[PDB]
Structure 1
Amino acid sequence: QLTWSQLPEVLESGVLDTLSTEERKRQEAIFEILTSEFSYLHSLSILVTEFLQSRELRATMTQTEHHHLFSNILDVMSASQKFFEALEQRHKAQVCVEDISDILEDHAQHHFHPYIAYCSNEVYQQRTLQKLSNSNAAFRDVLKEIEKRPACGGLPMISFLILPMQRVTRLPLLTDTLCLKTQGHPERYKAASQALKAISKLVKQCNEGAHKMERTEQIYTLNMQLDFGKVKSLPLISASRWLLKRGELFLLEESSIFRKIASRPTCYLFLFNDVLVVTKKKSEESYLVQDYAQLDHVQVRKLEPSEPLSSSVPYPFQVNLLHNSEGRQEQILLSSDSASDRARWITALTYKENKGELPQVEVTKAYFAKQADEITLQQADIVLVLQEEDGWLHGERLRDGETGWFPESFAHSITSRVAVEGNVRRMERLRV
């Protein structure tokens, strides 16, 4: 609640009568890194004390599920603690802090490695929590009782578990502000800028580690679930292959003009960065491959409604395989029941095929990706809008360039020319 300029010691010092507005803002920038770190650290200690160290919660699980659920949270808290303590000694000693950029650079270079492992483990933490929630009744009961405890402040365990990912991606935003408010001081601007590069590099290797682990897990899970038995064999395992989109679509057949909305045939698509696989789903864990084609040899287009003078084919489109699993040509006629669904399929299928002029939007509430083509967004994230369709936006996040779909409901336009131009400049400052 109290800002730096409101602290009793700064008021007592009388420094405000002569302090420049830029040095004031720089002290506020330093202060906000300090208070936001403590608030985060305090939340981590609740996670550790109430969940990680719950004997009763460990008894519902195995040692392997506990490792995947909590990972190296103790190392994350310890690095946060040593970082906060360094900052707090600078704040305690002087009314006006000369600098913290050496602390930021040092810890981002030499002490924040546990963030990389924690972020990289996200896929397994999610799968472990899903399985425990779905199939472990004792876990659900103990978890429910812990969350009623006042110490949790009404928040569920999952919101504590993702705090390190949220924290690390906020440090470059806070360090960038500090750089801006340090421009009046030449040698400390250099140090702040070095700090900005170091922290941005750390966030990058966090982001790359989580992507590698999730893609590796998916390629192995899908290599097992996808049955190539009745088509020419296609090794699905690759160190570079990742899933763009998956989902069920209704099969159309142009030989029928009298289509029904009951017992509609389906197929199930797995679209990877370099290959489209067409399947029929046989169970949750098994899809029988019908055909596939290199993405390079896929074309797509919308199909037109029937000529005049309610359609069982609401939003149809057509996929042409120019060179399918037998080296021959095939077409697939598909229908989704949503306009935005069709648009997302077409966008993913044209994956293979100026930034200051793009519309910008600001995220009003957090959004958590539910599908491979969606993007997880934090409140106040800035997003460059690449496409809009039927309540869904396709955007590039400003801070890191991640791209995906999210509901338009979760953001509001930025129309100010000065803000829009400002966000663009912040973009190269932040990008690696």
Structure 2
Amino acid sequence: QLTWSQLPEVLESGVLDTLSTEERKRQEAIFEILTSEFSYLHSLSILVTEFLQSRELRATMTQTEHHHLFSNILDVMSASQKFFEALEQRHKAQVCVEDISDILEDHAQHHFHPYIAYCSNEVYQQRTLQKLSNSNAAFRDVLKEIEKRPACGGLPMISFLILPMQRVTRLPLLTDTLCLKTQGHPERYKAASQALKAISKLVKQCNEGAHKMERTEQIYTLNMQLDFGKVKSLPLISASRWLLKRGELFLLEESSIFRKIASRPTCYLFLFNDVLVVTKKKSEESYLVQDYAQLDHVQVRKLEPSVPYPFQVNLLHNSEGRQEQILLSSDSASDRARWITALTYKEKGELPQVEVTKAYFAKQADEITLQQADIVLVLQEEDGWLHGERLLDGETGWFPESFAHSITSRVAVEGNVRRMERLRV
């Protein structure tokens, strides 16, 4: 609750009477990094004490399941503590802290490596929790009882496990504000900038690691599931191929006008960044490929209108070297837009800006996870869904428009745009 200005030691010193307002802000900026860091470190300790070190929870899982669930949280927690400790000594030593940029850069360059591993392991962590919740009875019971305990603060385990990822994404914002407020001293500003570059570099490494691990898992898992026996074999595995969107769609026939809303034939699409694969789902883990085509040679178009939201996918060069047209429909206007936006994947400042109001977690390959106060540029709006590019890292995704509110005041708008340029890769 207390701010640096309200801090008892700062009052007794009475440095307030003679101190530039910008410096008061630099000290509040440094104080925010330390105060935010402690709350996270405390939240990490709850995760370690109530969940990681729960013998009963370990008893419900296997030696291997525990590693995926919790990962190197002990290593990540240890990294956070040493960092807070360095910052704290500076805070205790003097009423007005000279610099913390040296600690910011040093830790990001040499001691923040655990975050990259922890962030990259998210794909496994998520699937491990889901498998445990859906099919492990013993797990569900024990976790609820731990969640009921007062220390968790009636926060669920998942929200603790996502905290390291959230902090590292916000570290550049806190360091940025410092750079803005360190402009007054020339020598310090350069060091503060050194920090943002190192801090922003670390986020890039964590973001890339998450993508490499997640796409590598998807390409191997999908490679087994897609059965290319009937058609000309296509090598799916590649270190470059990733999944744009997957989904079931309704097959449309022009032969019959009188369609039904029951027992409608369907097809399942896997759309990769460079290839579209048309399959028909046999099991939950087998899909029989019917055709495929390079995204260079795929056209998409809305169909003139029941079975609403129809669209036509044209394979100009198909698996057999020929041309084929697929007529599909979806029962969601927003869903059709997401398929067209993906299928046209190959194809500034006047971009409407929105600010996240409620944390949103991505449920699909299209979507982009967003936490509160994240800014997102808006690219397309359809049926209550916004296709947008995250201001912090440039990642683009869909999310419901209900989680954000329009920012119209230019002074804010152009501030975020000028601010995004500073952290732009």
* Structure 2 counterpart SS, 1:406: strand
Per-residue CA shift, 1:336-391, capped at 9, x if unaligned? 111111110000000001x1110000000011001100000010100111111110
Per-residue CA shift, 1:196-237, capped at 9, x if unaligned? 000000000000000000000000110010111111111110
Q: CA deviation at 1:133?
A: 0.4
Per-residue CA shift, 1:167-220, capped at 9, x if unaligned? 000000000000000110100000000000000000000000000000000001
Q: 1:377 aligns with which of 370, 382, 389?
A: 370
CA distance in 1, matches of 2:404, 2:151: 32
TM-score by length of 2: 0.99
Q: CA deviation at 1:261?
A: 1.2
* Structure 1 counterpart SS, 2:349: helix
CA distance in 2, matches of 1:3, 1:143: 36
* Structure 1 counterpart SS, 2:354: strand
Q: CA deviation at 1:284?
A: 1.1
* Structure 1 counterpart SS, 2:340: helix
Q: CA deviation at 1:262?
A: 1.2
Per-residue CA shift, 1:111-151, capped at 9, x if unaligned? 00000000000000011101110111111111111111111
CA distance in 2, matches of 1:120, 1:342: 31
* Structure 2 counterpart SS, 1:48: helix
Question: Does 2:168 correspond to 1:164?
Answer: no
Q: CA deviation at 1:259?
A: 1.0
CA distance in 2, matches of 1:151, 1:9: 31
CA distance in 1, matches of 2:92, 2:269: 59
Q: CA deviation at 1:260?
A: 1.2
CA distance in 2, matches of 1:431, 1:108: 18
CA distance in 2, matches of 1:376, 1:39: 22
Residue number in structure 2 paired with 1:23: 23
The size of the alignment, in residue pairs, is: 425
Q: CA deviation at 1:392?
A: 0.5
Q: CA deviation at 1:413?
A: 0.4
Residue number in structure 2 paired with 1:271: 271
Per-residue CA shift, 1:44-86, capped at 9, x if unaligned? 0010011111111101111100111111100000000000000
Q: CA deviation at 1:32?
A: 0.2
CA distance in 1, matches of 2:37, 2:225: 43
- Where in structure 1 do 4 or more consecutive aligned residues deviate above 3 Å? none
CA distance in 1, matches of 2:156, 2:388: 29
Residue number in structure 2 paired with 1:45: 45
Unaligned 5+ residue runs, structure 2?
none
| RMSD between superposed Cα atoms in Å | 0.7
Unaligned 5+ residue runs, structure 1?
307-312
Per-residue CA shift, 1:264-291, capped at 9, x if unaligned? 0100000000000001011111111100
* Structure 1 counterpart SS, 2:249: strand
CA distance in 2, matches of 1:283, 1:13: 72
Residue number in structure 2 paired with 1:246: 246
Residue number in structure 2 paired with 1:104: 104
Q: CA deviation at 1:240?
A: 0.5
TM-score by length of 1: 0.98
Residue number in structure 1 paired with 2:128: 128
* Structure 1 counterpart SS, 2:40: helix
Per-residue CA shift, 1:285-338, capped at 9, x if unaligned? 1111100000110001001119xxxxxx21010000001110110000010111
* Structure 1 counterpart SS, 2:131: helix
CA distance in 2, matches of 1:230, 1:82: 58
* Structure 2 counterpart SS, 1:152: coil
CA distance in 2, matches of 1:137, 1:259: 43
Q: CA deviation at 1:238?
A: 0.6
CA distance in 1, matches of 2:424, 2:94: 33
Residue number in structure 2 paired with 1:200: 200
